């Protein structure tokens, strides 16, 4: 056995009635003196180990060759002043084991912590030597942690894309439905979850060109995505994955459901495809009124109305296609589809759960057009517009289909740094970066987005940790206050760095002028309601930080209505899976669902207790599975208000709660202005 | 008194061996000597052939003999255990571990194997002699269950249970320990159909039945030692399995309420260590906050 | 070439009668008509009966005549889905509609109906009738078995799927869906071991045996008719129940590798709403001409 | 039951020790009298029935503007003029079931055997009254048969291709794979059947850009394509079929081969995608010998060489791959790998075998490219080129795939008629124009090589047919003799035909000038060898009919060298499935499977006696499981040698029949020249 995880697996050793928790730091060191400098390639000077890197095609040249060398020098003295030192041994064993350059055999490790730092910073700075050491104290210090694809593939040659999420809007015809499934797979191989809209898509027994009963449906395309999605996995290390969204109105809402029962067939389900519904308020009002729903053939209201039935207004359409005899519509219970929705979700965690018009009440670029799905993790929320894809002797019509880029802030470093400014607004820079950096030339509509939008997203991690190492509950009102105060702050921050870039590159983001940014709109409830905490224990928290009051507000409203924003979304909370255990911190703004971590990695057991668990907070760190799913709602409604897209919001169920208690939790959600519930897992 | 309780444990351990995943135990497997792994095949094998008997024969004939639908239904549901559940897993194993053409040389040793095919000629023509309505031909297909159940799996459940303890072919050794709680319940439950047909005899007629489960069970047991010895020598264990059968052959007498005949020994400790959500309809007041 | 496949697809439809709530049903059973709650109880009498039979008969007496231990172990499954399972949800069904003496009164006048009689006789003589290695005797009984699971339950299906194609009786018209699901594939299984049998037969020896099976089907339906008008008149519906018995007649006949014997008709739309040949090696000089 | 069928059931009755096959034509008198003529749409003139047909959506204006109203009253009247009879109740059923027009609701009949022949002749001469009176009196006299696609759909406005068969090329590449799959999917939805060569993709287990063992193999893309034609099935009509080819050498052999087992897992069994082998001398060479043989990576292949493995010479290139240490390749036993073949056609009837050097050494188009697959029904052989389509933004560099329009000739009925200079012809020509007429808008390769090779597929059938009813055993020399004959007279005329149309156009096919009709190396056998009958018989069965001689073949040789050959491919003998029926012709040039065909159409049951059967003819019509499967071999071969393309040449096996048996007919159906074989099948 391993030294390192001997020692490692005396945290369970109970001494004295306690967990011996410092076992853990014994444990790091361990496994750094034992196995990490042991396996570490060392080079004379830094100057070989580049030359090294560079030409065994390891690194780029192209973004090396805008410093001199004296320059990433001092880039790498500064990341390596700060002589970082992994808290724990799971965090140091995920960095080496996930992040850290290896040899081409992998065998041997060629980067630290602090090589990948300074190059993921010489990165973004692009030629600048002080931006490159403010990206290195900001990655150093842990206040900011660039997603999994831009941290792993930051300056290396043989990489995938720095951005891992990408929304596709996929058109009611054979020519779209073909180019769907090689986008996802060109997609699917450079590494990115891909997220499909199928509500365009006619339902199963529509015609085809005046032949009825012809159309496969939404189920067929499901299949060919779940086959396409298998096919590229990138040599099945990390399989492809893809998810589908329907419209809850779409008649094909029931097989599409169908595909993820345990009793459904091989001809049905749909094993790499995630699923998500979008609800509208249309649909929560008829099951709360206990009425009869209709599910509507896309292709009858597109015949009858020109539009497609997700590009129209449901809440105000609805009536209007019930009462339209040309189009076709099948008669369905609402609250048994809830009921179906709660039990889907008990049995397999599916589908993700859009709340359409929570979404969209709030929605900035909703001229652009309204949010119709989410992504695969079920966070990214912006306004995406369909292509259509001619044959091939034919000029396409390109829309703009959705993908940002994914950054964390780590709440429990920035809040002990007080900088909360200085950290979006390089966070915000970084992720501009990657975005200008990003080109996709095997998905059009993907590319034009990422020129047109600029979308950015910045989320956080660490909430529940910051939290539990300070004595605050995360059920508890001053939780709420906390998060209310600090993700004010960073949508303020994020909303003037936006405006400083536009304001700098004299450009804003297409179709600004007619966001709600541009109106004025957007900062309604910030210039006209104060957000500073409302509880003494949190003030003292954000104490010598500035909060922006209402005059800030009204301030920064004028700020960006003399000079736009760049960004057309800037904020969304990613589920933050494998970066939280490098960064020592809790996943995203969700709880924690174990207080020490048992995981086996080969033939070897680990255990990773929370960062900061210690008899002083161990209650602090209460599960998610122990606390009220209501007050976790509220939480993340509080955050989602100064969010602009969505947050990736698992429920986390016991197994005595029955499926009226997750339908009363997605009411409930629904309710508070949740725009996306991503999982329904279950203990 | 008793067949509702057994119906709903019987149902509640329903069990695939699809289940459980076994290419974690291709390692350990791949590390046994080659006379380790070539008992351990055959000790399966032997296992197979008890299930299949107990499957296609046994199970289902004792059930077209009790009366009940209850008890029936228990019965056939038992018989689809063996041969649908329990046989079907060894191959699985197989497949998971070995090469066809070893697979393939194991079934045909089950064959010609000399000790199996005499305790499969035993319990199996027991099985076939019971004679409609006559409840004494029954008792001794009953007691020739109870020791195929409680007694002759066991010099074939020994070595997973040796390897399980060790920490060794552990998901293989899963699948094992749900056989084996499986047959505990099919021991009991028959034993306590063959007592029912027992208690209804005179003192005359009991005092030939206790001969005839006595004689029956020494027979088998010399076959089981011959077996054991063939099977173990060349691990070095067949003492132990032979404590082992000794200790579940007193298993099988107490399920059909005699006393033990073997006396108590110490058993391998290795081997001791070897051993939807809720529909609910949402109501209107669920949609108010 | 197809039992393994018949393996799986039995194992992942296993369902247990607790799964479905029954006590919901009540909300519509309270608002039929006295004529509707009678047809009801003696249609659900109906296919109690007869699965009974073949829970208790008709499937083990199949696989104790069928050879092969995999086709063994397949009908062990069915048999026990027949005694375990439908049985049970047949019963859960009555304890939720009718109190205990209503019950009892229904099975009595079900017991004594000429034309449930009739019908479970002639089947229940078939399986009485299979000699020991006759393979002609398995395949009439085997014919008979088909056309209990693929045609005589259509006549009672028909009455619980109207229900549940209208939003009535739903908890007790999902059980019924769940045991027709099963008993489609018993008919189908059972059907391609006949069809095996019939393909090893001369060709006036198939030719007889295909009257065999069209007799049987004529004397089946004509007391098919009579038992619809019987239940059915009284609710007005044995036109439509007519029309369903044939198209599961032809289902039937299919499943014997036989061609349809009616006419293809459409059915109710609220029922419908509710619904190897030698390897030999190359020796050289077959490469020279 | 209806009284058409209890007549035609009367057949089987036997009366006096004979079959009455004189109830079929009262089967068939009773069939039109009680059903057709009283389903049959009549209108007062013809005028007002082309009305409707042009204004109600079911005919093309733009084919009947070319004539005057009295040329298609006159057309039509020559159509009538012939008073033609349906001989049999089968041929009548399966016209008026198949092909006739049918009004929307498929209620009434618009079309009668005379009206679809005049629309199918009127689009055939395009514009030309005197030619489509001759395309009507070839048609209505059945001396030539259009394809099922052309005859079914020429001058329908809601009509799907006039070609069925595609074949593509399918290049190492993902752009190229999700090209395939799109192509495959557009020519599906079309109608037609897809054939595929996979021999380029590179085997499971290699590299994708520096990432080793990566590659799914071919079977992942087999997968795609199977669910991409289960989707595109014919808007719900008929299923899709597509077809798979590899070459035996190729590494994912066994693995291709696999996919067609009945034990076959879910994850890699295929269900509508066929499969065929292609087989080079090499491996016949290496079996014989029983030499252990090899295959090979083609990914390695193509780095070591720039080229693919099958776009290379296996006879030449195996020793020097072998040789090769940067050439990947496992040992297999070619023996072991034809035993497997073997079994695998007596299971399930696949794969297809293309015998790679028989078609070329005899294939006229090598400069072009070498014939590396075929179509579906085995029997397309043509040069292809590989099309690479780049990304999105860039051009794509478009080759050529195969397809081909397929007409067949009635031998029984050109020869009764003494016209098969005539009949050949004039199918040339309508083959010519359908081959124009042709525009796919989404396979560009496919546009490509119809618009560069113009080739056609001009087939026969009624062989066994006409033999059985003139006295003569299929398997006799005379069979053969005829054979021999009659089909060097059709190459003949059809080479003439080609010719001249070139001299009309004065455009010949492109690449032609490298051809081996340019350089006169095809003629060489033509030149030198005589074709005349050998038997007085069948010397006599071409009375009346000039036989070309040698000095005739120098003449035509002169001619094409002076003026050039118009089409690439002329000849293909496809199965002509159910066209046989109408035309009342055996299948093909394939013997007859029974005598009497049993079959079920709806709940009644039909009695289809093979056209011409009697009581003087019934052991002249022989079953094909009763054959000599040399014999067989012996007349395709005999045929093939006058045919450019292949022939769809089923094995009828008995169940006593071994592997050993069914290899030895591959063998010597190899050794004799033979292309392709189709079918395994077993009575
Ligand atoms: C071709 C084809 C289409 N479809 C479905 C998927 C598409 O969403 C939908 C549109 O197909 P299209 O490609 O748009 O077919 P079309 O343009 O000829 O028909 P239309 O005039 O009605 O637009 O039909 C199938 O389900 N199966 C098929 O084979
Ligand atoms: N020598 C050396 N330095 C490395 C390596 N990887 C990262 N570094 C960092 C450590 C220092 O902060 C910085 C400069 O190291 P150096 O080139 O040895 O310079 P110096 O120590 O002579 O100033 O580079 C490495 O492999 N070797
Ligand atoms: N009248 C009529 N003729 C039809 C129809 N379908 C095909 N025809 C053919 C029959 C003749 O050969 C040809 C001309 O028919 P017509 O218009 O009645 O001509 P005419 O005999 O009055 O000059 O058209 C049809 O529906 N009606
Ligand atoms: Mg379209
Ligand atoms: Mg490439
Ligand atoms: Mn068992
Ligand atoms: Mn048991
Ligand atoms: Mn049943
Ligand atoms: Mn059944």
Known sequence: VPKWIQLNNEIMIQKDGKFQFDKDKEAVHSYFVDYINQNTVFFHNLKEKLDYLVENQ??????????????????????????????????????????????????????????????????????????????????????????????????????????????????????????????????????????????KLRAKGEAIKDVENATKGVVGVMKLLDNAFRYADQMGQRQGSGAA?????????????????????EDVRVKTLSIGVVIPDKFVELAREDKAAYVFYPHTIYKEYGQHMDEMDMNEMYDKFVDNPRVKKEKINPRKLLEKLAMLRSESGYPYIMFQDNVNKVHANNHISKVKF?????????????????????????????????????????MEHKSIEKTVKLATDSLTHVSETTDIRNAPAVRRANKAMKSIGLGAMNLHGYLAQNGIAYESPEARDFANTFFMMVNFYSIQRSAEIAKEKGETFDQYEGSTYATGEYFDKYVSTDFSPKYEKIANLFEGMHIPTTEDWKKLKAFVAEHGMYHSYRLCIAPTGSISYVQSSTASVMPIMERIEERTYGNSKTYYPMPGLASNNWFFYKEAYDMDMFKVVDMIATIQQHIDQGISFTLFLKDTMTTRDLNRIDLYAHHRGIKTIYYARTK | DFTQMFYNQNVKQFWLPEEIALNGDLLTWKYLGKNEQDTYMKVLAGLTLLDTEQGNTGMPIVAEHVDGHQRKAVLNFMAMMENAVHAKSYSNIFMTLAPTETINEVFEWVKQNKYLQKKAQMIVGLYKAIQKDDEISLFK????????????????????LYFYGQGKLMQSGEIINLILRDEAIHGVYVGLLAQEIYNKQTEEKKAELREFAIDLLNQLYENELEYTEDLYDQVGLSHDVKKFIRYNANKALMNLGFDPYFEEEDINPIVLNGLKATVEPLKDDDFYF
Chains 1, 4 share one sequence.
């Open chain 1, 58 to 199: 390891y690194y780029e040249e192209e973004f090396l060759s805008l410093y001199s060398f004296e320059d990433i020098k001092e880039v790498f003295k500064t990341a390596y002043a700060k002589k970082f030192r992994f808290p724990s041994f799971m965090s140091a064993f995920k960095f080496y084991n996930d992040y850290a350059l290896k040899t081409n055999d992998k065998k041997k490790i060629l980067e630290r912590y602090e090589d990948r730092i300074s190059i993921v910073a010489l990165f973004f700075a692009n030629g600048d030597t002080e931006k490159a050491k403010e990206y290195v104290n900001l990655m150093i210090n842990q206040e900011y942690q660039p997603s999994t694809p831009t941290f792993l593939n930051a300056g290396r040659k043989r990489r995938g894309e720095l951005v891992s999420c990408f929304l596709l809007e996929v058109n009611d015809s054979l020519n779209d439905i073909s180019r769907a499934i090689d986008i996802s797979m060109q997609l699917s191989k450079l590494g990115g979850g891909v997220s499909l809209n199928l509500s």
């Open chain 1, 245 to 265: 969204y329907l419209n809850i109105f779409h008649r094909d809402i029931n097989d599409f459901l169908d595909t993820k029962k345990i009793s459904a067939d």
């Open chain 1, 374 to 414: 989410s992504n695969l993790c079920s966070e990214v929320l912006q306004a995406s517009q369909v292509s259509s894809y001619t044959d091939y002797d034919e000029e396409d019509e390109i829309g703009l289909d959705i993908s940002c880029n994914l950054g964390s802030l780590n709440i429990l470093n920035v």
């Open chain 2, 141 to 160: 297909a009953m007691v020739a269950s109870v020791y195929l159940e409680s007694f002759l799996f066991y010099s074939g459940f020994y070595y997973p």
